[PDB]
Amino acid sequence: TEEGKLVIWINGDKGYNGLAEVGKKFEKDTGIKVTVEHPDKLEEKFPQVAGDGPDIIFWAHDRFGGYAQSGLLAEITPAAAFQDKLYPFTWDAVRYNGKLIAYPIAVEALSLIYNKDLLPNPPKTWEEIPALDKELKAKGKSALMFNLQEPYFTWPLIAADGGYAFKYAAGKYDIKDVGVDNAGAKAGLTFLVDLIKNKHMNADTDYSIAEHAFNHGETAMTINGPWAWSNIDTSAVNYGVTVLPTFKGQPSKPFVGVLSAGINAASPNKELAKEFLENYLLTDEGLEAVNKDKPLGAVALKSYEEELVKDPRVAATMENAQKGEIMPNIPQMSAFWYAVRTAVINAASGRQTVDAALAAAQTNAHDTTVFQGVAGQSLQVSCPYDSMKHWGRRKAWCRQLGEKGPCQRVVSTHLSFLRRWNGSTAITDDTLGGTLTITLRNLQPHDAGLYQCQSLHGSEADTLRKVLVEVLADPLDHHHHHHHH
Ligand SMILES: OC[C@H]1O[C@H](O[C@H]2[C@H](O)[C@@H](O)[C@@H](O[C@H]3[C@H](O)[C@@H](O)[C@@H](O)O[C@@H]3CO)O[C@@H]2CO)[C@H](O)[C@@H](O)[C@@H]1O
Ligand SMILES: OCCNc1ccc(Br)cc1
Secondary structure (H helix, E strand, O other), X not given: OOOOEEEEEXXXXXXXXXXXXXXXXXXXXXXXXXXXXXXXXXXXXXHHHXXXXXXXXXXXXXXXXXXXXXXXXXXXXXXXXXXXXXXXXXXXXXXXXOXXXXXXXXXXXXXXXXXXXXXXXXXXXXOOHHHHHHHHHXXXXXXXXXXXXOHHHHHHHHHHOOOEEEEEEOXXXXXXXXXXXOHHHHHHHXXXXXXXXXXXXXXXXXXXXHHHHHHOOOEEEEEEOHHHHHHHHHHOOOEEEEOOOEEOOEOOOOEEEEEEEEEEOOOOOHHHHHHHHHHHHOOHHHHHXXXXXXXXXXXXXXXXXXXXXXXXXXXXXXXXXXXXXXXXXXXXXXXXXXXXXXXXXXXXXXXXXXXXXXXXXXXXXXXXEEXXXXXOOOEEEEEEOOOOOOOXXXXXXXXXXXXXXXXXXXXXXXXXXXXXXXXXXEEEXXXXXXXXXXXXXXOOHHHXXXXXXXXXXXXXXXXXXXXXXXXXXXXXXXXXXXXXX
């Protein structure tokens, strides 16, 4: 960052050229240069560089609770008159611990996109896709192609019969109640895997492959968001945007994302960012400039949404959004997505069965795992990992210094042993089996807290597991004569 200018990060699938046009208008009126960038993995780079992060970060709201907890985002305090211009639902997406941590921009949900020439009557159920694919294959076409590398696209099907991320009850999420390995989640993922086994879909289909096949008239349907419509408009394919197919008679339940713009807590340009976001971007003209490049979906700005909702594609986006639910913005969402991404990729490739893939995802979707030990005794912490993925990497055990501090290295593999506070920590790695083991001797309350098992590569560290060490009292420490009769 540099004082007197704005650097913005936004994902490569969004209208970054339209956003740059709003930046050009801001520069024309004020002299302030606005640079819009679309780095790869920007959502993973942001917490590592936020140092030299951007002034503004755009992403769906699900990642922002984690950034806010880490102290990376400035609290936003728009006037009541400004808050009244955006929908209360969109403000709900960006409120964390009672404070607003980003400006909401647009509401997104996946829909079924279909080729009206190949399929004038798209299927209402997922169950009828195998027979439809057989008929289309006889004509050199396929029924459906969509991104199988990101769990966001398969989640509507996994959630349809009962899968869920974190149980919700009266404005709160229970982070201990995860629904990744229930009967409904297994049924949805088994249906997806059966589509691949029967050659109705390919496990390696990604965003680019599905978009190219649909936009070239090779597949009758795709599953995508509003941002994808402008490339289809250019392709001249006669497309429709409609309700996703049902599974076991239940609607598919897409996770609803609210594209949001957070202000970096370390930015010396917070006031410029606020003026740009409130008075340039979040205006009917500003949002239209972005929408014209890549559609936003249902915008957070009431005045513009009242017009956009007349677009049948936007009404279809809201119909699918209403069948699903808003993603939580809680810090625990990252772990949930990483676990489900792994389960889908492994089940689709045949590397794991659906049952084993979802059992591992259920365990790993929990951001932290408690390891309880008794004071004065030894505690063995286990960190399973993918031996192939982490082949050749050294490992580390680090202790989290508060909610916002660094994870401070304790021991690593090749100082693998550390004696401190009359106790000790030793790390051992079974590289063939994929199990990292940390042994804490003479466990005491001073050892309680959050730690990470890590896999190192270059100057980066991958989190293998977050562990909460809990220390039960030594039974002898309460030595007394109990009551008798
Ligand atoms: O898959 C690992 C991946 O998990 C998490 O990513 C999720 C996003 O945080 C979540 O917003 C959603 O992303 C979709 C966007 O909302 C949508 O606008 C569009 O850009 O498509 C995105 C899906 O590709 O879903 C993903 C999970 O698929 C986590 O935050 C990432 O760092 C991680 O790489
Ligand atoms: O060639 C198979 C041995 N190679 C290999 C590479 C990646 C994974 Br996942 C599994 C196996």
